[PDB]
Coordinates of C-alpha atoms and ligand atoms in Angstrom, one line a residue:
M21 CA -68.8 32.2 -1.0
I22 CA -69.4 29.4 1.6
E23 CA -71.2 30.1 4.8
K24 CA -69.9 28.8 8.2
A25 CA -73.1 29.3 10.2
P26 CA -74.8 28.2 13.4
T27 CA -77.2 25.3 13.0
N28 CA -80.1 27.6 14.3
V29 CA -80.7 30.4 11.8
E30 CA -81.8 32.6 14.7
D31 CA -78.3 32.6 16.1
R32 CA -76.9 34.4 13.0
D33 CA -77.5 37.8 14.3
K34 CA -76.4 37.2 17.9
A35 CA -72.7 37.9 17.2
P36 CA -70.6 39.7 14.5
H37 CA -70.1 38.6 10.9
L38 CA -66.6 38.0 9.5
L39 CA -65.7 37.8 5.8
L40 CA -62.7 35.4 5.5
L41 CA -60.8 35.4 2.2
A42 CA -57.6 33.8 0.8
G43 CA -55.9 32.9 -2.4
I44 CA -56.0 36.3 -4.2
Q45 CA -52.5 35.1 -5.3
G46 CA -52.6 31.5 -6.7
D47 CA -49.2 30.5 -5.4
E48 CA -49.9 31.3 -1.7
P49 CA -51.2 28.0 -0.4
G50 CA -50.9 28.8 3.3
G51 CA -53.9 31.0 2.9
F52 CA -56.2 28.8 0.9
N53 CA -55.3 25.6 2.8
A54 CA -56.2 27.5 6.0
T55 CA -59.6 28.6 4.6
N56 CA -60.1 25.0 3.4
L57 CA -59.4 23.5 6.8
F58 CA -61.6 26.2 8.4
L59 CA -64.5 25.2 6.2
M60 CA -63.9 21.5 6.7
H61 CA -63.2 21.3 10.4
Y62 CA -64.6 24.3 12.3
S63 CA -68.0 25.2 13.6
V64 CA -69.4 28.7 14.2
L65 CA -72.0 28.8 17.0
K66 CA -73.3 32.4 16.9
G67 CA -72.9 35.1 14.3
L68 CA -71.5 34.1 10.9
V69 CA -68.3 33.6 9.0
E70 CA -68.6 34.0 5.2
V71 CA -65.6 32.4 3.4
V72 CA -64.2 32.7 -0.1
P73 CA -61.6 30.0 0.2
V74 CA -59.7 30.9 -3.0
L75 CA -60.3 34.3 -4.7
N76 CA -58.2 33.5 -7.8
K77 CA -59.0 29.9 -8.6
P78 CA -57.8 29.8 -12.2
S79 CA -54.4 31.0 -10.9
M80 CA -54.4 28.5 -8.1
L81 CA -55.0 25.7 -10.6
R82 CA -51.8 26.6 -12.4
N83 CA -49.7 27.3 -9.3
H84 CA -49.4 30.9 -10.5
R85 CA -49.4 34.2 -8.7
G86 CA -52.0 35.6 -11.0
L87 CA -52.8 34.6 -14.6
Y88 CA -54.5 38.0 -15.3
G89 CA -52.1 40.1 -13.3
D90 CA -52.2 41.0 -9.6
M91 CA -55.8 40.6 -8.5
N92 CA -55.0 42.6 -5.4
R93 CA -54.3 45.7 -7.4
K94 CA -57.8 45.8 -8.9
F95 CA -59.9 47.3 -6.1
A96 CA -59.7 50.9 -7.2
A97 CA -59.6 52.0 -10.9
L98 CA -60.4 49.0 -13.1
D99 CA -61.0 48.7 -16.9
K100 CA -64.5 47.3 -17.5
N101 CA -62.9 44.8 -19.9
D102 CA -60.5 43.3 -17.4
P103 CA -60.9 39.5 -17.4
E104 CA -61.3 39.7 -13.6
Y105 CA -63.7 42.6 -13.5
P106 CA -66.8 40.3 -12.8
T107 CA -64.8 38.5 -10.0
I108 CA -63.8 41.9 -8.5
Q109 CA -67.4 43.0 -8.4
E110 CA -68.5 39.8 -6.6
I111 CA -65.8 40.3 -4.0
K112 CA -66.5 44.1 -3.5
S113 CA -70.2 43.3 -3.1
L114 CA -69.5 40.7 -0.4
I115 CA -67.2 43.2 1.4
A116 CA -69.7 46.0 1.2
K117 CA -72.7 44.0 2.5
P118 CA -74.3 45.7 5.5
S119 CA -74.3 42.3 7.3
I120 CA -70.5 42.1 7.2
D121 CA -68.6 43.7 10.1
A122 CA -65.0 42.6 9.6
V123 CA -62.8 41.3 6.8
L124 CA -59.7 39.0 7.2
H125 CA -57.6 38.5 4.1
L126 CA -54.9 35.8 4.2
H127 CA -51.6 35.9 2.3
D128 CA -48.3 34.1 2.2
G129 CA -45.3 36.5 2.1
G130 CA -41.5 36.4 1.7
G131 CA -39.1 36.5 4.7
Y132 CA -40.2 37.9 8.0
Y133 CA -41.4 41.4 8.4
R134 CA -39.6 43.5 11.0
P135 CA -40.3 47.2 11.5
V136 CA -36.6 47.9 11.8
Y137 CA -33.9 46.5 9.4
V138 CA -32.3 43.5 11.1
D139 CA -31.0 41.7 7.9
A140 CA -32.0 40.8 4.3
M141 CA -34.5 38.2 5.6
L142 CA -35.8 40.3 8.5
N143 CA -36.7 43.9 7.6
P144 CA -39.6 46.3 6.7
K145 CA -39.5 45.4 3.0
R146 CA -40.5 41.8 3.9
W147 CA -44.0 40.5 4.5
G148 CA -43.9 37.2 6.4
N149 CA -45.5 36.7 9.8
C150 CA -47.2 40.0 10.4
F151 CA -50.8 41.2 10.9
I152 CA -51.6 44.2 8.8
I153 CA -53.9 47.2 9.1
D154 CA -54.4 50.1 6.7
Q155 CA -54.8 52.6 9.6
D156 CA -55.4 52.5 13.4
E157 CA -59.1 53.5 13.4
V158 CA -62.0 53.3 11.0
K159 CA -64.7 55.7 12.2
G160 CA -68.2 54.4 11.8
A161 CA -67.2 50.7 11.8
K162 CA -69.0 48.4 14.3
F163 CA -65.5 47.9 15.7
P164 CA -63.6 51.1 14.9
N165 CA -60.4 50.3 16.9
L166 CA -58.4 48.3 14.3
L167 CA -55.2 48.9 16.2
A168 CA -56.5 47.3 19.5
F169 CA -58.0 44.4 17.6
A170 CA -54.7 43.9 15.7
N171 CA -52.6 44.0 18.9
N172 CA -54.8 41.5 20.7
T173 CA -54.8 39.1 17.7
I174 CA -51.0 39.4 17.6
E175 CA -50.9 38.5 21.3
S176 CA -53.0 35.3 20.6
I177 CA -50.7 34.2 17.8
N178 CA -47.5 35.0 19.8
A179 CA -48.7 32.7 22.6
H180 CA -48.2 29.8 20.2
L181 CA -44.8 30.4 18.4
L182 CA -43.0 27.3 17.0
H183 CA -39.7 29.2 16.9
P184 CA -38.8 32.8 18.1
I185 CA -38.0 33.9 14.6
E186 CA -41.7 33.5 13.7
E187 CA -42.9 36.2 16.2
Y188 CA -45.7 38.3 14.7
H189 CA -45.5 42.1 14.5
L190 CA -48.0 44.8 13.7
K191 CA -47.7 46.3 10.3
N192 CA -49.7 49.5 9.7
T193 CA -49.3 50.5 6.0
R194 CA -51.0 54.0 6.6
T195 CA -52.5 53.4 3.2
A196 CA -54.4 56.7 2.7
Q197 CA -51.2 58.7 3.3
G198 CA -49.5 57.9 0.0
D199 CA -49.2 54.2 -0.4
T200 CA -50.4 54.1 -3.9
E201 CA -50.1 50.3 -4.2
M202 CA -52.1 49.5 -1.0
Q203 CA -54.6 52.1 -2.2
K204 CA -55.5 49.5 -4.9
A205 CA -55.8 46.6 -2.6
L206 CA -58.6 44.7 -0.9
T207 CA -58.4 45.8 2.7
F208 CA -58.3 49.5 1.9
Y209 CA -61.4 49.0 -0.2
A210 CA -63.0 47.3 2.9
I211 CA -62.1 50.1 5.3
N212 CA -63.7 52.6 2.8
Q213 CA -66.9 50.7 3.4
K214 CA -66.5 51.2 7.1
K215 CA -65.6 47.5 7.7
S216 CA -62.8 46.7 10.1
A217 CA -60.3 45.0 7.8
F218 CA -57.1 43.0 8.5
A219 CA -54.6 41.0 6.5
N220 CA -52.6 38.1 7.9
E221 CA -49.3 37.1 6.3
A222 CA -47.6 33.7 6.9
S223 CA -44.0 33.4 5.9
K224 CA -43.2 31.6 2.6
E225 CA -40.0 30.5 4.4
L226 CA -42.3 28.1 6.4
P227 CA -43.4 24.6 5.4
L228 CA -47.1 24.5 4.3
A229 CA -48.4 23.0 7.6
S230 CA -46.7 25.8 9.6
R231 CA -48.0 28.5 7.3
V232 CA -51.5 27.1 7.7
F233 CA -51.0 26.8 11.5
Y234 CA -50.2 30.6 11.7
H235 CA -53.2 31.5 9.5
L236 CA -55.4 29.4 11.7
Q237 CA -53.9 31.1 14.8
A238 CA -54.8 34.5 13.3
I239 CA -58.3 33.4 12.4
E240 CA -58.9 32.2 16.0
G241 CA -57.3 35.3 17.5
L242 CA -59.6 37.6 15.5
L243 CA -62.7 35.5 16.1
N244 CA -62.0 35.8 19.8
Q245 CA -61.7 39.6 19.6
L246 CA -65.0 39.7 17.6
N247 CA -66.6 37.4 20.1
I248 CA -67.7 35.0 17.4
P249 CA -67.8 31.7 19.3
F250 CA -66.4 28.7 17.4
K251 CA -65.1 25.1 17.8
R252 CA -62.8 22.9 15.8
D253 CA -62.6 19.1 15.7
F254 CA -58.8 18.9 16.0
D255 CA -55.8 20.0 18.1
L256 CA -54.1 23.0 16.5
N257 CA -50.4 22.0 16.1
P258 CA -48.4 21.6 13.0
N259 CA -48.6 17.8 13.1
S260 CA -52.4 17.9 13.4
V261 CA -52.6 20.5 10.6
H262 CA -50.3 18.3 8.3
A263 CA -52.6 15.3 9.0
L264 CA -55.7 17.2 7.9
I265 CA -54.0 18.7 4.8
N266 CA -52.9 15.3 3.8
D267 CA -56.1 13.5 4.9
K268 CA -56.6 10.0 3.5
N269 CA -60.4 10.6 3.8
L270 CA -60.3 13.4 1.2
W271 CA -62.0 12.6 -2.0
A272 CA -63.0 14.1 -5.4
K273 CA -66.0 13.1 -7.5
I274 CA -65.7 14.0 -11.2
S275 CA -69.0 14.2 -13.1
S276 CA -71.2 11.1 -12.3
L277 CA -68.1 8.9 -11.7
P278 CA -67.5 7.4 -8.2
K279 CA -65.7 9.2 -5.4
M280 CA -62.0 8.8 -5.7
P281 CA -59.4 9.3 -2.9
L282 CA -57.4 12.5 -3.5
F283 CA -54.1 11.1 -2.0
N284 CA -52.1 8.1 -3.2
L285 CA -53.7 8.0 -6.7
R286 CA -51.4 6.8 -9.4
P287 CA -49.7 9.9 -10.9
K288 CA -51.4 9.1 -14.3
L289 CA -54.8 7.5 -15.0
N290 CA -55.2 6.3 -18.6
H291 CA -58.3 6.1 -20.8
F292 CA -60.2 8.1 -18.3
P293 CA -63.8 8.8 -19.3
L294 CA -64.9 12.4 -19.4
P295 CA -68.2 13.9 -20.8
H296 CA -67.8 15.1 -24.4
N297 CA -68.7 18.6 -25.6
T298 CA -67.9 19.9 -22.1
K299 CA -65.3 22.5 -21.4
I300 CA -62.9 21.3 -18.6
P301 CA -63.9 24.2 -16.1
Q302 CA -67.5 23.2 -16.7
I303 CA -67.1 19.5 -15.7
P304 CA -68.9 19.0 -12.4
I305 CA -66.5 18.3 -9.6
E306 CA -67.5 17.6 -5.9
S307 CA -65.1 17.2 -2.9
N308 CA -65.2 17.2 0.9
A309 CA -62.5 19.9 0.4
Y310 CA -63.2 23.3 -1.0
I311 CA -60.0 23.9 -3.1
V312 CA -60.3 21.0 -5.6
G313 CA -60.5 21.5 -9.4
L314 CA -59.7 20.3 -12.9
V315 CA -57.4 22.1 -15.3
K316 CA -56.4 21.3 -18.9
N317 CA -52.6 20.9 -19.4
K318 CA -51.8 20.0 -23.0
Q319 CA -54.0 17.0 -23.8
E320 CA -54.2 15.9 -20.1
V321 CA -56.5 17.0 -17.4
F322 CA -54.9 17.7 -14.0
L323 CA -56.7 17.0 -10.7
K324 CA -55.6 19.7 -8.4
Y325 CA -56.0 20.1 -4.6
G326 CA -54.8 23.7 -4.0
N327 CA -51.3 23.7 -5.6
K328 CA -50.9 19.9 -5.2
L329 CA -51.2 17.7 -8.3
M330 CA -53.2 14.7 -7.3
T331 CA -53.2 12.9 -10.7
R332 CA -52.9 13.5 -14.4
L333 CA -56.0 12.2 -16.3
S334 CA -55.5 11.0 -19.9
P335 CA -59.1 11.4 -21.1
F336 CA -61.2 9.9 -23.7
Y337 CA -64.2 12.0 -24.4
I338 CA -67.5 10.2 -24.7
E339 CA -71.3 10.6 -24.3
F340 CA -72.3 10.0 -20.6
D341 CA -75.7 8.2 -21.1
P342 CA -77.4 8.5 -17.7
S343 CA -79.9 5.6 -18.3
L344 CA -78.1 3.0 -16.2
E345 CA -78.8 3.6 -12.5
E346 CA -77.8 0.3 -11.0
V347 CA -76.1 -3.0 -11.8
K348 CA -76.7 -6.5 -10.3
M349 CA -73.5 -7.7 -8.8
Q350 CA -72.3 -10.4 -6.4
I351 CA -69.8 -9.3 -3.7
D352 CA -68.0 -12.0 -1.6
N353 CA -70.8 -14.5 -2.6
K354 CA -73.5 -12.0 -1.6
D355 CA -75.8 -10.8 -4.4
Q356 CA -76.9 -7.2 -4.4
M357 CA -77.8 -4.2 -6.5
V358 CA -74.9 -1.6 -6.8
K359 CA -75.6 2.0 -7.8
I360 CA -73.6 3.3 -10.8
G361 CA -71.1 5.7 -9.3
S362 CA -70.6 3.6 -6.2
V363 CA -67.4 2.3 -4.4
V364 CA -67.8 -1.2 -3.1
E365 CA -65.4 -3.0 -0.7
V366 CA -64.3 -6.6 -1.6
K367 CA -62.6 -9.1 0.6
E368 CA -62.3 -12.0 -1.8
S369 CA -64.4 -11.9 -5.0
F370 CA -67.0 -10.3 -7.1
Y371 CA -69.2 -11.1 -10.1
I372 CA -71.2 -8.9 -12.5
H373 CA -74.5 -10.4 -13.8
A374 CA -74.9 -10.2 -17.5
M375 CA -77.1 -7.4 -18.8
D376 CA -79.0 -6.9 -22.1
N377 CA -77.6 -4.0 -24.0
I378 CA -74.8 -3.2 -21.4
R379 CA -71.1 -4.3 -21.7
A380 CA -68.8 -4.3 -18.7
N381 CA -65.1 -3.7 -18.8
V382 CA -63.2 -4.5 -15.6
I383 CA -60.1 -2.4 -15.9
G384 CA -57.2 -4.6 -15.0
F385 CA -59.0 -7.9 -15.8
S386 CA -59.0 -9.6 -19.1
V387 CA -59.8 -13.0 -20.7
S388 CA -58.8 -12.0 -24.3
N389 CA -57.3 -9.2 -26.4
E390 CA -60.7 -7.8 -27.3
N391 CA -60.4 -4.0 -27.3
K392 CA -64.1 -3.6 -26.3
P393 CA -64.7 -6.7 -24.1
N394 CA -67.7 -7.8 -22.0
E395 CA -66.5 -9.1 -18.7
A396 CA -69.8 -9.7 -17.0
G397 CA -70.3 -13.3 -16.0
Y398 CA -66.8 -13.8 -14.6
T399 CA -66.0 -14.5 -11.0
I400 CA -63.1 -12.2 -10.3
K401 CA -60.5 -12.2 -7.5
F402 CA -57.6 -10.0 -6.5
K403 CA -55.1 -12.4 -8.1
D404 CA -56.9 -11.9 -11.5
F405 CA -55.9 -8.3 -11.7
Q406 CA -52.9 -6.8 -13.5
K407 CA -52.0 -4.5 -10.6
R408 CA -50.6 -1.6 -12.8
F409 CA -54.2 -0.8 -13.9
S410 CA -55.2 0.1 -10.3
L411 CA -56.5 3.6 -9.6
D412 CA -54.3 3.8 -6.5
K413 CA -50.6 3.4 -5.6
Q414 CA -51.7 0.7 -3.1
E415 CA -53.0 -1.5 -6.0
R416 CA -56.3 -2.1 -4.2
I417 CA -58.9 0.0 -6.2
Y418 CA -60.1 -1.0 -9.7
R419 CA -62.4 0.6 -12.2
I420 CA -65.4 -1.2 -13.7
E421 CA -66.7 0.7 -16.7
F422 CA -70.0 0.1 -18.4
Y423 CA -70.9 0.8 -22.1
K424 CA -74.2 0.9 -24.0
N425 CA -73.2 0.9 -27.7
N426 CA -70.7 3.7 -28.1
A427 CA -71.8 5.6 -25.1
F428 CA -70.5 5.5 -21.5
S429 CA -73.1 4.2 -19.0
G430 CA -71.1 4.7 -15.8
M431 CA -68.3 3.4 -13.5
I432 CA -68.3 1.5 -10.2
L433 CA -65.1 1.1 -8.2
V434 CA -64.1 -2.0 -6.4
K435 CA -61.8 -1.7 -3.4
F436 CA -60.0 -4.8 -2.2
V437 CA -59.9 -4.7 1.7
Ligands
MHI501 C1 -41.1 39.0 -5.1 C2 -42.6 39.1 -5.6 N1 -42.9 40.4 -6.2 C3 -43.6 38.8 -4.4 O1 -44.1 37.7 -4.4 N2 -43.8 39.8 -3.5 C4 -44.6 39.7 -2.3 C5 -45.3 41.0 -2.1 C6 -46.1 40.9 -0.8 C7 -47.6 41.2 -1.0 O2 -48.1 40.8 -2.1 N3 -48.3 41.7 0.0 C8 -49.8 42.0 -0.1 C9 -50.2 42.8 1.1 C10 -51.7 43.2 1.0 C11 -52.2 43.5 2.4 C12 -53.6 44.2 2.4 N4 -53.5 45.5 1.8 C13 -54.7 43.3 1.7 O3 -55.3 43.8 0.8 O4 -54.9 42.2 2.1 C14 -50.0 42.9 -1.4 O5 -49.1 43.8 -1.6 O6 -50.9 42.7 -2.1 C15 -43.7 39.3 -1.1 O7 -42.6 39.9 -1.1 O8 -44.2 38.5 -0.3
CA502 CA1 -62.8 17.4 10.9
CA503 CA1 -50.1 38.1 -1.4
CA504 CA1 -60.9 -5.7 -18.9

């Protein structure tokens, strides 16, 4: 859970609290890209929005609806030995917190829901582009009138339709009256804790940016109904959404390695250092996004951003010796200390000063066929690189790797600008 909170802690209790959740199915990227963009680009000014951006991360990482079965059928009877049992308790505990008032659960769904059969794509069996309640009223909730809240949220979404076919409709599953499937799902659990609970569906027929657009419309519609004041730092249209999903400023930091751009990496990165004796899911990974991770696939390690494959790492596993903190380098004739794990911009040249006990391999530069070379003490320019060794498709970013005996002492990236 990630908090989107006012800067003044005192403002937390001055408006309602919403719990915003997506990615209970790992192949529904509208939902988890929307929670991602919300965390990255919105501000909550009073009250609080608690976000679990992706409920089923292992499944997201494999582009899979649910590796351990349908997580959204696990909110009623559940075997204590179910692999998702701990996850389910975390979620139910967030839902049932006295400080939470409302719950919004995002999904992507096939076709377009219509309450009357129109055709195979538009009918009551379909799920796309609807706003869903389990029943019209939840007595004892802070906001008991789910129906009114839903109708007003649908109004807000329908003020912004990209095409008429995308019109939102109310879907009331009347769950307690015999819907045994929905009785096992998240929002029904929430209403049983006297929370006002809603699900939004964006149609799988839509491109990702349009799915995310509609989820964000639903989030804003509901925040307005709750009177949780918010801002965002962008204009809400599909182009703007696309730009932010595919943002060149997105990065990932694996272990103590430098920040790497998410987009426009080469599809495969060879001889990539990873800490030994460390299970893949336990390798630290930081990002300015909230849906990034690593997953093992055969012998490779995939860098994932939602369902997008950003690169395939071909690792070599090695001790990460943390002793080397900085390296003396010259950049465009300007001498300076460079922290291990830095990215440095270069216009013309660089040079690494020799070090006792430390060997430098500039990846893409060579002066011999030594398999374990020392390339400190060379003045290096762009023309000196074999461009295929670049980290990026643009052939501008190069790895410098440092070794102390048989241990890995760190990496610095140079970016030619
Ligand atoms: C074809 C394949 N079985 C498939 O992906 N079906 C989906 C089925 C649609 C689907 O999952 N809705 C959700 C609705 C849940 C709403 C609400 N109670 C909640 O807890 O948020 C579900 O039932 O968990 C499709 O048609 O979009
Ligand atoms: Ca932003
Ligand atoms: Ca779903
Ligand atoms: Ca080299």
